[PDB]
Design a protein around this ligand. Structure first.
Ligand SMILES: [Cl-]
Ligand SMILES: [Cl-]
Lengths: 399, 399
């Protein structure tokens, strides 16, 4: 059920999540606590996400909703496994559930049709809903970052990496997709090159890129360390079907207005890349030959061009955020709105926010086809199309 | 040219400012520096403002654009007065203009037709525009807060109060309306019950309310002190035509998110008020008899209802933000989006953001007619309708 051996191959199946009531439950004083960037006008953001989904569907892509995938898995499970799912959810809920309120929540959840129940689990629960009186409006917090399906897990060739989020507020999001990879017959046998239980280190979706059939590119950032990368390398060596033979690790230290490797660099075509004009000049890299044991990180150095050349074996076309010659104001604004994170749905065809006009212009001038959409409210979340999606199946490249 | 003896009298003439390029020049890192709340999707915010203006116009209100009023004044002035205006603008420009750049900016400004020149002054100037190469993309910062015409000056009966802003970034805004009140024949003779030159203390538009022909209500806040209120009191006593006989000063304790009286209480009808449920229970008031000299601030205490009753002489109807029984989540969100600041265009008829649904519902249930508009982007500026307008002429009440 999983086959992603590039960042650009024609997209066939992708996972997304149209936001539900959870983005209505973020108090302005809890933006940091919930690790979300702003208070959205929900109805508008939701319609905008639907616009994003529609574009993907009109391009023959099968768009799968997280809530539907979880609901489908649930229906196929035994009563004990189903209950096991509900119980784990109650255990990880925040704020922690009081003993006499837990059973009230559980009965409430079970009173809804499967898909609506899953949606309540994602949205969180208001005290009013349970007829409970108290100042705190929420019995259970919602998970506002769920529409960023790029984080809980990342497809990786024929397997997946179920990521280790940083803060507990976001670690609650993993229960859904993990339930799918554990019980859904279509994904149950997907090999896990990383999981939150039998490995070492930490790793996040933003640092994971698949350049081609043989090369995996991971960022060594503040969120992804060598320990996790080593676990991934060994798990891959133990799998016979995987075609990966090499891992290129790119050192990504904290920089102003940037974060994971994705804010630094994205791949849009066989030889076209979008990058931050404010990244470092000479990159620190680590080459890992997967055909050799034990796994060893071979340190190397080079400009972005040199590093890219060593992977695609041809001159890379580098496009800076906001285009060449842009002033710092435009660069800052379009970086702020996640300008590098366009989602590539086919070689040279991308999807992103229309507000990032300078970057859009530079992309079309370089021969890339851009399918923009209005995300006037969605964009306040600070994450673009690549962040709001997780490819499940892409047509392998013939290069 | 000025006649505003209430907060609710049928609105005949009002001053607004549809944002120009200035709201395109706010770097995300300069939100605090420019004292603005977020990075707007300019084109969208501008159309939303036009929608706001359209509603006012469709209600028979004469809407006056600040840029047009300034341009009109400029044309009527002598060459020496005109240049006097340009020079002061150049003097107050930020960042400070370099000696060799100043003359370049001046010629640039003079090369545009009058109204376009005024718009450049308001919008600020990019280095690209002058073909200058430097670090700062801006030669002159824009004044993003210009569309909040409630701040520079506040109509007060038959006169005006040209306010003393707090930070220099916003003090630059006063030059435009002041130029009008100084040279336009229609406003030239308007008495100034306060100005940035011959008085004491500080005062801001958000603290000034006109309840009726005889009562002026001013908030004693972190932005408005007794010194400024005394200056206003004396200046009013010196005017023969003014009908004000009393001033009620309400103490507004500086909270983390409270700099003016307007976000605590607004008047929407002869006996209907919108208030913040997070305000103090017992108010500290000061009664000033304008028929008495010298001016003495007579302290007094009472509940919101008691204080209001002492002014309108009838039972006041109090409507809380988000309505009665609302949970803290809805109160917090609608407070965040300036829920009290509806603009009253006639007794019991208001205009405001459609996103504040709970407050809107409470208002209609209370008998108030609400003319909402989409401000999905404008609202990010943290100021509602009353903040985006300055009544010039209101039909006097007959009560
Ligand atoms: Cl957009
Ligand atoms: Cl709105």
């Amino acid at each position: 059920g999983i086959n992603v051996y590039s960042e650009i191959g024609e997209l066939k199946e992708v996972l997304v999540h149209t936001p539900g009531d959870e983005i209505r439950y973020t108090a302005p004083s809890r933006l940091e606590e919930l690790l979300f960037s702003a208070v959205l006008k929900a109805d508008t953001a939701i319609e905008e996400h639907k616009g994003f989904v529609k574009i993907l569907q009109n391009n023959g892509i099968k768009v799968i909703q997280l809530c539907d995938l979880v609901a489908e898995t649930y229906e196929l499970c035994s009563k004990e496994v189903r209950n096991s799912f509900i119980e784990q959810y109650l255990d990880e809920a925040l704020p922690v559930l009081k003993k006499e309120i837990r059973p009230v929540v559980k009965d409430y959840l079970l009173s809804f049709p499967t898909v609506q129940m899953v949606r309540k689990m994602m949205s969180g629960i208001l005290a009013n809903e349970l007829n409970i009186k108290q100042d705190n409006p929420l019995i259970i917090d919602g998970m506002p970052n769920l529409y960023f399906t790029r984080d809980p897990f990342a497809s990786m060739g024929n397997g997946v990496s179920i990521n280790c989020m940083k803060y507990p507020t976001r670690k609650r999001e993993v229960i859904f997709s993990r339930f799918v990879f554990t019980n859904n017959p279509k994904y149950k046998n997907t090999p896990r090159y990383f999981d939150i239980v039998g490995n070492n280190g930490t790793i996040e979706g933003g640092d994971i890129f698949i350049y081609n059939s043989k090369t995996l590119v991971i960022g060594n950032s503040e969120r992804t360390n060598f320990a996790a990368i080593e676990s991934v390398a060994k798990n891959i060596q133990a799998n016979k079907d995987c075609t990966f033979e090499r891992i290129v690790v790119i050192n990504v230290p904290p920089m102003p207005n940037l974060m994971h490797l994705d804010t630094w660099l994205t791949m849009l075509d066989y030889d076209k890349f979008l990058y931050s004009p404010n990244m470092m000049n000479v990159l620190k890299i680590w080459e890992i030959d997967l055909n050799v044991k034990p796994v060893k990180f071979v340190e190397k150095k080079g400009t972005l061009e040199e590093v890219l050349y060593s992977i695609i074996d041809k001159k890379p076309i580098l496009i800076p955020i906001a285009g060449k010659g842009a002033n710092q104001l435009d660069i800052d604004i379009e970086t702020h709105f996640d300008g590098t994170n366009y989602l590539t749905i086919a070689p040279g065809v991308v999807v992103g926010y229309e507000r990032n006009e300078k970057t859009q212009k530079a992309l079309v001038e370089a021969g890339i086809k851009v399918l923009s959409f209005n995300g006037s409210q969605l964009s306040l979340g600070m994450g673009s199309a690549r962040c709001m999606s997780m490819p499940l199946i892409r047509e392998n490249l013939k290069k």
